[PDB]
Enzyme design. Structure first.
Site, PDB file in Angstrom:
ATOM      1  N   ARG A  57       0.858  -1.182   0.000  1.00  0.00           N
ATOM      2  CA  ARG A  57       0.000   0.000   0.000  1.00  0.00           C
ATOM      3  C   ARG A  57       0.893   1.231   0.000  1.00  0.00           C
ATOM      4  O   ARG A  57       1.622   1.471   0.967  1.00  0.00           O
ATOM      5  CB  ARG A  57      -0.935  -0.005   1.199  1.00  0.00           C
ATOM      6  CG  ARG A  57      -1.842   1.200   1.267  1.00  0.00           C
ATOM      7  CD  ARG A  57      -3.211   0.808   1.779  1.00  0.00           C
ATOM      8  NE  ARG A  57      -4.095   1.962   1.888  1.00  0.00           N
ATOM      9  CZ  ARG A  57      -4.990   2.123   2.854  1.00  0.00           C
ATOM     10  NH1 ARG A  57      -5.119   1.202   3.797  1.00  0.00           N
ATOM     11  NH2 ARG A  57      -5.754   3.206   2.880  1.00  0.00           N
ATOM     12  N   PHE A  72       1.029  10.399   1.564  1.00  0.00           N
ATOM     13  CA  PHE A  72       0.549   9.966   2.871  1.00  0.00           C
ATOM     14  C   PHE A  72       1.500   8.992   3.553  1.00  0.00           C
ATOM     15  O   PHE A  72       1.998   9.301   4.640  1.00  0.00           O
ATOM     16  CB  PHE A  72      -0.849   9.348   2.743  1.00  0.00           C
ATOM     17  CG  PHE A  72      -1.680   9.453   3.993  1.00  0.00           C
ATOM     18  CD1 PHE A  72      -1.501   8.562   5.035  1.00  0.00           C
ATOM     19  CD2 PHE A  72      -2.648  10.434   4.117  1.00  0.00           C
ATOM     20  CE1 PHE A  72      -2.260   8.649   6.181  1.00  0.00           C
ATOM     21  CE2 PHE A  72      -3.413  10.525   5.262  1.00  0.00           C
ATOM     22  CZ  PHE A  72      -3.219   9.631   6.294  1.00  0.00           C
ATOM     23  N   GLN A  90       3.006   1.312   3.520  1.00  0.00           N
ATOM     24  CA  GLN A  90       2.814   0.240   4.486  1.00  0.00           C
ATOM     25  C   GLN A  90       3.370  -1.066   3.936  1.00  0.00           C
ATOM     26  O   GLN A  90       3.299  -1.334   2.734  1.00  0.00           O
ATOM     27  CB  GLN A  90       1.330   0.083   4.837  1.00  0.00           C
ATOM     28  CG  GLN A  90       0.902  -1.309   5.274  1.00  0.00           C
ATOM     29  CD  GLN A  90      -0.485  -1.322   5.884  1.00  0.00           C
ATOM     30  OE1 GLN A  90      -0.957  -0.307   6.396  1.00  0.00           O
ATOM     31  NE2 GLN A  90      -1.147  -2.469   5.830  1.00  0.00           N
ATOM     32  N   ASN A 117      -1.688  -0.815  13.114  1.00  0.00           N
ATOM     33  CA  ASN A 117      -2.610  -1.654  13.859  1.00  0.00           C
ATOM     34  C   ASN A 117      -3.919  -1.845  13.094  1.00  0.00           C
ATOM     35  O   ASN A 117      -4.121  -1.312  12.001  1.00  0.00           O
ATOM     36  CB  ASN A 117      -2.848  -1.061  15.247  1.00  0.00           C
ATOM     37  CG  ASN A 117      -3.353   0.370  15.199  1.00  0.00           C
ATOM     38  OD1 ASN A 117      -3.642   0.906  14.129  1.00  0.00           O
ATOM     39  ND2 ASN A 117      -3.453   1.000  16.364  1.00  0.00           N
ATOM     40  N   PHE A 144       4.462   0.799   8.968  1.00  0.00           N
ATOM     41  CA  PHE A 144       4.353   1.772   7.896  1.00  0.00           C
ATOM     42  C   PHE A 144       5.210   2.987   8.207  1.00  0.00           C
ATOM     43  O   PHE A 144       5.413   3.353   9.370  1.00  0.00           O
ATOM     44  CB  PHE A 144       2.893   2.167   7.639  1.00  0.00           C
ATOM     45  CG  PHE A 144       2.314   3.116   8.649  1.00  0.00           C
ATOM     46  CD1 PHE A 144       1.646   2.636   9.760  1.00  0.00           C
ATOM     47  CD2 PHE A 144       2.392   4.485   8.460  1.00  0.00           C
ATOM     48  CE1 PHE A 144       1.094   3.501  10.679  1.00  0.00           C
ATOM     49  CE2 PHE A 144       1.845   5.354   9.378  1.00  0.00           C
ATOM     50  CZ  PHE A 144       1.195   4.862  10.488  1.00  0.00           C
ATOM     51  N   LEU A 197      -2.397  11.933  13.503  1.00  0.00           N
ATOM     52  CA  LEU A 197      -2.463  10.489  13.692  1.00  0.00           C
ATOM     53  C   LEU A 197      -2.157  10.080  15.125  1.00  0.00           C
ATOM     54  O   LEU A 197      -2.620   9.028  15.580  1.00  0.00           O
ATOM     55  CB  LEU A 197      -1.498   9.802  12.730  1.00  0.00           C
ATOM     56  CG  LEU A 197      -1.480   8.276  12.746  1.00  0.00           C
ATOM     57  CD1 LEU A 197      -2.761   7.738  12.133  1.00  0.00           C
ATOM     58  CD2 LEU A 197      -0.262   7.751  12.009  1.00  0.00           C
ATOM     59  N   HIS A 237      -1.406   5.542  17.765  1.00  0.00           N
ATOM     60  CA  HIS A 237      -0.453   4.774  16.977  1.00  0.00           C
ATOM     61  C   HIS A 237       0.913   4.846  17.639  1.00  0.00           C
ATOM     62  O   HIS A 237       1.280   5.874  18.215  1.00  0.00           O
ATOM     63  CB  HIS A 237      -0.375   5.283  15.532  1.00  0.00           C
ATOM     64  CG  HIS A 237      -1.308   4.582  14.591  1.00  0.00           C
ATOM     65  ND1 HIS A 237      -1.446   4.952  13.271  1.00  0.00           N
ATOM     66  CD2 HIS A 237      -2.138   3.529  14.775  1.00  0.00           C
ATOM     67  CE1 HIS A 237      -2.328   4.162  12.684  1.00  0.00           C
ATOM     68  NE2 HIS A 237      -2.762   3.290  13.575  1.00  0.00           N
TER      69      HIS A 237
END
Lengths: 499, 172, 48, 130, 478
Positions: free
Chosen positions: B60, B65, B68, B107, B118, B127, B131
């Site tokens: 991904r 952004f 991952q 997660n 990631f 975020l 996390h």
């Protein structure tokens, strides 16, 4: 210069032979001359391109050009001659012209035949002049049908089994080649990839070098006979018309060596440098195995086939044992064998078809009716014996010198392998003279009736002499075929990394 | 930013029957304030019964952004595990997201860390709070950005496979 | 150990096909009931 | 069956505005509305607190549905095509939802020998049109 | 009130005209309708020429389809029918059978195949396979006084009933589990608001669909019906089936498996593979031992060649569909050429078995050459077209990871070279005392010649001129 030569040199034979079709003129006569004239024109254009449009002093590519052909998988008309190619190109033109001449008294079809000859001509030159890997493969497999037709239409008693084994075997062998194509084509196709010149700088990861190396080596061992992959040769040589077999066992075999030199030693060094010693061992044992099984055969055509097999060990051992001369002595060897094997098969097919006896035991004294065949046969037998003077000696000598001065060996196998290689000189005459003695010496019945027994006329005798003279000319002064300065860059990559 | 304990190196390979090398990433692991998670990562990146990142991918790549990866099982995100069973709870939220280049255990709902990690190619202040933070890239930012700028299909996967050939630990 | 071994192998790789073809060619052979039976067996086993 | 694994982020939003029926929240309106026709969105559905049980990204092409005729959760059809007191989402828009359990499956689960949704749940969405 | 059926409304008009002329006219029909039907076909092709480079616009109440990729196959089936009719005119002419309803059957089957290429309706995509199968047990048995043509109606009707049954049962399971839905696009929604997707069920409605699909295009484990029928029915309908049935089935399969089966990829990608790995093996071995021409063609050109088409449906990220389109375009021509040659020689002599093609090179060399060309192309040799077909099929399919399918493909192609070269060898011969008294009495010598000669050069030129074809085939999103 930009006036394209190689494009002409590749598209001239097949094109100018396509006019044989749609030409209702005769049964056999006019087609022979219309084909020999095209062959001579092509050979003259070849030598004109070589003489005044080549340098011998720079290891780059010459006369190159390219276009856009399919453009999805990048595959162009990329085409260019180089040092390694030049010798084989000239030899192909020469020996194929002389084979087409040797095919003079063929009237069975004589229209499909000469056209197929020209097609094989164009295909051989296309391969030997290729510069794009996929195009190299195309030229490789293009000839596969013409040779099958020449086998299945003319030649031998059991033509069918030989032809089908040959075609199936070669087509299967080319599968691993296509596998290697797909392997190194997709490896970063944005970087040209399918331009055999711009692949010298590829740094492939481990465990992939080996797979591509083997995918090419299997196909090559199929084309160029290597011990466990040689079973096809005796059938497709003992059953082929001598006209076909001349170019077959003089050019088509050497493609398996030219490709191995061009795409393995030049592109995959650390996949070839960790696999050279086993190549050397295989060639060393082949030199003796081929002869030890040749001595056993009983029809001299298969004996000649196995003698051709044996000399293909010097080429192997020269490809391994990485030196300038070891690689360079291999080229002289492929030339001096494309001469000798071709001529020997021509002589075998010319002696036969006059006696209609294939088994070497009933051959009486043929020296009494036809002297000139006996002379030109003993001469080329001597040539094949690696006898000095003739070109069958200096090639093997340079191969020995390349193995001896090799850097990737320390004196333990560098001597035992030389020993097992020199046993070939003790072994080869034992099976060549055993044929020369049964088939020619001795006094058979009073073969006085000059019917079905006539010495070679002018055409065959001139063919023999015109192929013989280069042998002497090369064996006396072997710098006519050491015009190779690519090895000074070909063996430049390998020469320091580990081990 | 905090103290550094271990340094892990990642290979990067693109091409889609096989991956040619393009560069090399070198990341630090804060074994001083998130010891269990850092130890999990460092152990995965080496060996210890084969549950490692050798031959993983980056399944991904959301341009501007994040990237991952770490699904050494299914290559789809629904796979991968960790040494302490298959998952374990959050460890701590001491280190916070700062800027270009951080590591976060991707997660699937709090207290469900796994193999999916990631890297943030950009700043992500929003975020934080839910996390973990256990690493920042020390060498190879340009290669990370090159991967981030790769071509993507509708599923936000990279159209050219981006695998990790070899991964290991490289000490100070 | 050349004709009897490696020629044997390079023929048995092209000869075993000549036998396998005709061998698997002589099962069933008409009798539409057998066609439907062999068509149901694969459907049933594929359900696993 | 029941929940499985995933991984993503959320692009933390502002405070939700319930608007008397559901929980509405806007992130980015871009281009243009959509009539009672076939649409093509990308979702990532949560549980009330943390868990994620499906995401359109966990497959290939994000799924395609009908916005305007009742074929989907009433919550969504109210929060994507635009409900009473809520503006519809643009073509390239992006919104976030918390679905109350009356506009959802309601107080009974969907069983498959193991209910794939907790009985009487109320889930979350991060819906981005495409 | 819609022009997206007009490509088929023209065909319906021609159908009604063909039915009317026999009701009204007396005897002026035989060479008249022979071209009047071709008028309808070429007019439908011209109508389809308009919708090139169009939108994915949805159908009547969203029923069948209208996009680019589907339009490609919609035109391809028309191409097959246009090339096939001139073959299936003179053949049935030289049997003293009624010809009107034969052309009517062929036209209606082509119509069904054309409608099938779309059909995102779950019901239209059920009636259309019947509109293509109900008009198939007739043609495949439309020589009543023969005996074999009845066996190849029994063991075709029973099989095509059982298979369509299994398929529609899978459809019913899907309609059930999907909370109630038909529209092909609108299943992954409806299979979610009803949360019964990841459950058993769907796993059954996938196999009960894939099996009914396989039977229609006959991979190995269900190939049983094909070798018989292709020998029992007249050769022209054999060709018509072996081209348009495969085209329509492969056009329906990709859409029915890619649109409503996003999630189950890893569980049908494998499945189709199990078929392909078998299809390109069991369809070749037997092909070696054959002695009849039609049955050997059934084995080789269908039992196998329906392998490498599939060989990318599994390995497809929309970067491969172009290669499937190109290979289909190559296969149609390289198959209709050899079928035209076979029809011509069989009619001119009266035999089918291989052992009678001896010496044909000497009597008439043009036909022998134009058959050898197509056969070698089927073999896949470099300068021809089949080579580049198989090549671009592998180069995109090795570029997608899967390895234990390309190697098997190349190996079985090498294997397939055998019988091609066998019949080729049987062509070139001059042993006068060997040729049977069949080619010996051959008065060598319009329609069939034209079809054979314009279909054989398309088996040599496009393999070298595939650049614009490739540039065209890349714009497919379905």
């Amino acid at each position: 210069s930009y006036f394209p030569w190689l494009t002409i040199l590749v598209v001239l034979p097949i094109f100018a032979g396509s006019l044989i079709f749609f030409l209702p003129h005769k049964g056999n006569k006019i087609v022979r001359w219309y084909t020999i004239s095209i062959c001579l024109l092509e050979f003259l254009l070849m030598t004109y391109a070589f003489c005044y449009h080549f340098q011998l002093e720079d290891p780059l590519i010459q006369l190159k050009e390219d276009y856009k052909w399919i453009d999805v998988f990048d595959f162009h008309w990329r085409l260019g001659i180089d040092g390694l190619s030049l010798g084989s190109i000239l030899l192909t033109g020469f020996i194929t012209t002389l084979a087409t001449l040797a095919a003079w008294p063929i009237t069975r079809n004589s229209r499909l035949f000469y056209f197929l000859m020209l097609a094989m001509y164009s295909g051989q030159i296309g391969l030997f002049s290729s510069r794009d890997l996929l195009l190299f493969f195309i030229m490789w497999e293009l000839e596969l049908i013409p040779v099958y037709l020449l086998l299945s239409m003319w030649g031998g008693k059991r033509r069918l089994y030989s032809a089908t084994k040959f075609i199936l075997y070669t087509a299967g062998g080319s599968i691993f080649f296509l596998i290697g194509v797909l392997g190194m084509g997709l490896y970063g196709s944005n970087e040209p990839g399918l331009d055999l010149e711009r692949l010298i700088n590829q740094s492939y990861p481990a465990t992939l070098e080996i797979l591509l190396y083997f995918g090419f080596l299997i196909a090559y061992a199929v084309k160029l006979p290597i011990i466990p992959l040689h079973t096809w040769l005796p059938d497709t040589h003992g059953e082929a018309h001598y006209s076909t077999c001349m170019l077959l066992a003089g050019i088509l075999l050497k493609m398996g060596a030219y490709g191995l030199i061009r795409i393995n030693m030049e592109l995959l060094p650390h996949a070839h440098y960790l696999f050279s010693p086993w190549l050397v061992i295989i060639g060393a044992i082949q030199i003796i195995y081929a002869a030890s099984t040749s001595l056993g055969q009983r029809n001299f055509k298969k004996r000649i086939a196995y003698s051709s097999v044996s000399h293909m060990g010097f080429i192997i051992i020269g490809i391994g044992s990485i030196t300038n001369i070891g690689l360079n002595g291999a080229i002289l060897q492929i030339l001096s064998h494309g001469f000798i094997g071709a001529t020997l098969f021509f002589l075998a097919g010319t002696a036969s078809d006059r006696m209609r006896l294939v088994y070497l035991e009933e051959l009486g004294g043929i020296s009494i009716p036809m002297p000139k065949i006996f002379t030109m046969f003993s001469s080329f037998s001597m040539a094949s014996l690696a006898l000095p003077g003739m070109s069958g000696f200096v090639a093997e000598l340079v191969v020995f010198f390349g193995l001896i001065t090799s850097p990737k060996f320390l004196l333990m196998p560098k001597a035992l392998i030389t020993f097992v290689m020199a046993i070939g000189m003790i072994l080869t005459p034992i099976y060549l003279l055993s044929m020369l003695r049964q088939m020619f010496y001795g006094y058979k019945l009073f073969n006085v009736p000059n019917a079905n027994f006539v010495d070679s006329g002018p055409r065959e005798l001139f063919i023999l002499i015109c192929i013989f003279l280069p042998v002497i000319g090369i064996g006396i002064y072997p710098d006519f075929v050491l015009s190779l300065s690519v090895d000074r860059v070909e063996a430049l990559l390998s020469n320091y990394y580990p081990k | 930013q905090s103290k550094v304990t271990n340094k892990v190196y990642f290979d990067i390979n693109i091409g889609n029957p096989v991956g040619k090398n393009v560069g090399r990433i070198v990341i630090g692991l804060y074994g001083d304030d998130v010891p269990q998670t850092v130890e999990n990562f460092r152990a995965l990146c080496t060996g210890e019964k084969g549950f490692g990142y050798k031959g993983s991918s980056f399944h991904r790549v959301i341009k501007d952004f994040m990237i991952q990866g770490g699904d050494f099982d299914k290559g789809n995100g629904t796979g991968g595990k960790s040494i302490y069973g298959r998952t374990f709870k959050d460890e701590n939220f001491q280190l916070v997201h700062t800027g270009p280049g951080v590591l976060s255990m991707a997660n699937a709902g709090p207290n469900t860390n796994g193999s999916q990690f990631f890297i943030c190619t950009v700043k992500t202040p929003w975020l934080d709070g839910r996390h973990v933070v256990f690493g920042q890239v020390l060498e190879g930012m340009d290669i990370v950005r090159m991967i981030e700028s790769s071509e993507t299909d509708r599923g936000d996967r990279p159209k050219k496979k981006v695998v990790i050939s070899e991964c290991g630990e490289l000490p100070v | 150990f050349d004709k009897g071994v490696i020629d044997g192998i390079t023929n048995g790789v092209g000869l075993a096909s000549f036998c396998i073809g005709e061998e698997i060619k002589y099962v069933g052979g008409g009798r539409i009931s057998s066609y439907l039976f062999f068509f149901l067996c694969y459907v049933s086993v594929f359900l696993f | 069956a029941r929940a499985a694994l995933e991984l993503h982020r959320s692009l933390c939003p502002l405070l939700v505005s319930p608007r008397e029926l559901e929980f509405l929240q806007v992130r980015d309106p871009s281009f243009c509305s959509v009539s009672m026709v076939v649409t093509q969105i990308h979702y990532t559905a949560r549980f009330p607190d943390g868990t994620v049980f499906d995401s359109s990204y966990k497959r290939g092409r994000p799924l395609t549905m009908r916005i305007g005729a009742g074929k989907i959760l009433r919550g969504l059809q109210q929060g994507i095509g635009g409900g009473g007191g809520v503006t519809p989402m643009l073509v390239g828009g992006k919104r976030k939802l918390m679905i109350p359990p009356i506009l959802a499956y309601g107080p009974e689960p969907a069983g498959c020998f193991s209910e794939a949704v907790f009985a009487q749940a109320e889930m979350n969405f991060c819906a981005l049109a495409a | 009130n819609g022009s997206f059926i007009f490509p088929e409304c023209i065909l319906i008009f021609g159908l009604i005209l063909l039915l009317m002329i026999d009701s009204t006219s007396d005897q002026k029909d035989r060479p008249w309708f022979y071209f009047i039907s071709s008028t309808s076909l070429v007019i439908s092709i011209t109508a389809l020429l308009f919708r090139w480079r169009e939108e994915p616009i949805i159908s009547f109440s969203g029923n069948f389809q209208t996009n680019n990729f589907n339009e490609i196959f919609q035109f391809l089936i028309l191409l097959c029918s246009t090339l096939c009719i001139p073959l299936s005119v003179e053949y049935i002419e030289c049997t003293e059978m009624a010809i009107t309803e034969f052309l009517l059957f062929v036209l209606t089957a082509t119509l069904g195949g054309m409608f099938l290429c779309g059909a995102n309706d779950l019901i239209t995509i059920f009636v259309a396979p019947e509109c293509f199968s109900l008009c198939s047990y007739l043609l495949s048995g439309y020589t009543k006084r023969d005996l074999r043509s009845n066996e190849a109606t029994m063991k075709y009707l029973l099989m095509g009933g059982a298979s369509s049954s299994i398929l529609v049962h899978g459809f019913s399971w899907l309609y059930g589990s999907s909370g109630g839905e038909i529209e092909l696009q609108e299943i992954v929604n409806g299979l979610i608001n009803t949360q019964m997707y990841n459950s058993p069920g769907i796993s059954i409605a996938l196999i009960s669909i894939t099996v009914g699909l396989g039977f229609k295009l006959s991979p190995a484990p269900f190939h049983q019906w094909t070798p018989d029928v292709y020998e029992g029915s007249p050769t022209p309908v054999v060709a018509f089936l072996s081209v348009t049935s495969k085209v329509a089935a492969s056009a329906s399969a990709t859409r029915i498996l890619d649109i409503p089966f996003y999630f189950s990829s890893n569980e049908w990608h494998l499945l189709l593979e199990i078929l392909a790995i078998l299809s390109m093996i069991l369809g070749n071995l037997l092909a070696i031992t054959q002695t009849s021409m039609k049955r050997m063609l059934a084995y080789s050109s269908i039992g196998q060649i329906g392998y490498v088409i599939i060989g990318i449906i599994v390995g497809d990220s929309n970067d491969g569909y172009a290669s499937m389109i190109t290979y289909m375009l190559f296969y149609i021509s390289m198959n209709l050429g050899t079928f035209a040659c076979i029809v011509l020689f069989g009619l001119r002599t009266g035999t089918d078995n291989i052992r009678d093609y001896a010496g044909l090179y000497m009597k008439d060399p043009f036909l022998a050459l134009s058959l050898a060309l197509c056969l070698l192309s089927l073999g896949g040799l470099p300068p021809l077209a089949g080579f580049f077909g198989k090549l671009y099929l592998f180069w995109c399919g090795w570029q997608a990871g899967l390895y234990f399918l390309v190697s098997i493909g190349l190996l079985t192609s090498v294997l397939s070279i055998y019988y091609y070269l066998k019949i080729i060898k049987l062509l070139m011969t001059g042993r006068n005392q060997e040729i049977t008294p069949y080619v010996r009495n051959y008065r060598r010598s319009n329609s069939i010649e034209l079809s054979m000669t314009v279909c054989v050069i398309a088996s040599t030129i496009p393999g070298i001129s595939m650049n614009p074809i490739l540039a065209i085939a890349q714009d497919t999103l379905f």
